[PDB]
Design an enzyme around this catalytic site. Sequence first.
Site, short mmCIF file in Angstrom:
data_model
loop_
_atom_site.label_atom_id
_atom_site.label_comp_id
_atom_site.label_asym_id
_atom_site.label_seq_id
_atom_site.Cartn_x
_atom_site.Cartn_y
_atom_site.Cartn_z
N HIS A 61 0.83 -1.20 0.00
CA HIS A 61 0.00 0.00 0.00
C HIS A 61 0.86 1.24 0.00
O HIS A 61 0.47 2.24 -0.59
CB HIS A 61 -0.92 0.04 1.22
CG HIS A 61 -1.74 -1.19 1.38
ND1 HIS A 61 -2.70 -1.49 0.49
CD2 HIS A 61 -1.75 -2.14 2.34
CE1 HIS A 61 -3.31 -2.63 0.88
NE2 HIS A 61 -2.72 -3.03 2.01
N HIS A 91 5.41 6.96 6.74
CA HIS A 91 5.13 6.56 5.40
C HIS A 91 4.60 7.75 4.63
O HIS A 91 4.35 8.80 5.24
CB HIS A 91 4.13 5.40 5.31
CG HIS A 91 2.81 5.79 5.90
ND1 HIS A 91 2.53 5.70 7.24
CD2 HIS A 91 1.76 6.37 5.33
CE1 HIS A 91 1.32 6.20 7.45
NE2 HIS A 91 0.81 6.63 6.31
N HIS A 93 1.93 9.07 1.17
CA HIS A 93 0.93 8.87 0.15
C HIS A 93 1.32 9.80 -0.99
O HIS A 93 1.76 10.92 -0.74
CB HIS A 93 -0.48 9.22 0.64
CG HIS A 93 -0.82 8.47 1.89
ND1 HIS A 93 -1.59 7.34 1.90
CD2 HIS A 93 -0.51 8.70 3.20
CE1 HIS A 93 -1.72 6.92 3.15
NE2 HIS A 93 -1.05 7.71 3.99
N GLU A 103 -3.45 13.42 1.00
CA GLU A 103 -4.72 12.96 1.57
C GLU A 103 -5.51 14.17 2.08
O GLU A 103 -6.59 14.47 1.63
CB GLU A 103 -4.46 11.93 2.65
CG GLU A 103 -3.80 10.72 2.07
CD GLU A 103 -4.12 9.47 2.80
OE1 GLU A 103 -3.81 9.44 4.00
OE2 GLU A 103 -4.65 8.51 2.19
N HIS A 116 3.30 11.01 6.66
CA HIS A 116 2.65 10.71 7.92
C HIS A 116 3.63 10.08 8.88
O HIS A 116 4.14 8.98 8.64
CB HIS A 116 1.49 9.71 7.69
CG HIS A 116 0.33 10.36 6.97
ND1 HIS A 116 -0.62 9.63 6.35
CD2 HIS A 116 0.08 11.68 6.81
CE1 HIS A 116 -1.46 10.49 5.82
NE2 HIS A 116 -1.08 11.74 6.09
N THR A 195 -6.36 6.63 7.77
CA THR A 195 -6.83 6.86 6.43
C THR A 195 -6.80 5.58 5.56
O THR A 195 -7.15 5.65 4.39
CB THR A 195 -6.07 7.96 5.70
OG1 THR A 195 -4.76 7.48 5.43
CG2 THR A 195 -6.01 9.27 6.49
#
Length: 257
Positions: A61, A91, A93, A103, A116, A195
């Site tokens: 992911h 990590h 996104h 996000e 994050h 999330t």
Amino acid sequence: HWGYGKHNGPEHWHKDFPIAKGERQSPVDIDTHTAKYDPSLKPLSVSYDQATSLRILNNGHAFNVEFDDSQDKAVLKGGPLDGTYRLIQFHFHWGSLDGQGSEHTVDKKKYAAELHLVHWNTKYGDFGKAVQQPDGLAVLGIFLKVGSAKPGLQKVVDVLDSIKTKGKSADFTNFDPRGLLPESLDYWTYPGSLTTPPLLECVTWIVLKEPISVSSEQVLKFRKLNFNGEGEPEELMVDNWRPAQPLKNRQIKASFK
Ligand SMILES: CC(=O)Nc1nnc(S(N)(=O)=O)s1
Ligand SMILES: CC(=O)Nc1nnc(S(N)(=O)=O)s1
Ligand SMILES: CC(=O)Nc1nnc(S(N)(=O)=O)s1
Ligand SMILES: [Zn+2]
């Protein structure tokens, strides 16, 4: 088997994780004009001097940089928080394109990526217990915009080739996450959720106002990761972001005017 694709992405998650439609889901759009300055919010205390990174993992992911959270080595305190929160991992996104990937949004603006830094409240003893509590986690969110390179990011970029596919990990010791922070610690904060599934409503979100700049080459390397495992057809790991969710009965607070 959730993910970010057309058939298993964010619009489907509620079927397996009904809290997706809950009252304190994340991320949200941060409407800067409607956020309320709260002069009683304290400065953040980011104490990362003794941080001990261990490993980097492609989990299918995102990729996680994991820390030793068995002692108070890298902690977050202050701000809206009561007590001490230990850094467990960070990590990102990110998008397929520079105009998407974050996000959280700011006045509907999307950033190229979002970092994050995930912390858990030590009063709960372990992360698994913390995620079952409304004040269990504190996630420090940092926007990434494309421009100049972020020198403190390059050691992460440089290892991604070694964790291209799901399930791969690599040693990642002696990484200093202070190199990922912007100059200012001005922030917005609100109560939200993870999330990603299981979308638990356990997070105090602390989103920094000031983005960091990363280079186009740095984010291009993120986009060379794969969602799939080795030996499977290649699925580039891009667009691993959940869109903004309804604010519902929440107010976003600002630490600054
Ligand atoms: C084959 C298939 O779709 N399996 C799924 N498992 N969970 C999913 S979801 N609702 O969390 O996105 S889809
Ligand atoms: C182990 C752990 O940190 N799991 C997370 N799941 N979602 C997260 S996020 N995107 O809300 O920070 S963190
Ligand atoms: C130096 C500085 O603060 N730059 C910013 N760029 N955008 C901002 S935002 N997230 O408040 O829109 S702050
Ligand atoms: Zn995240």
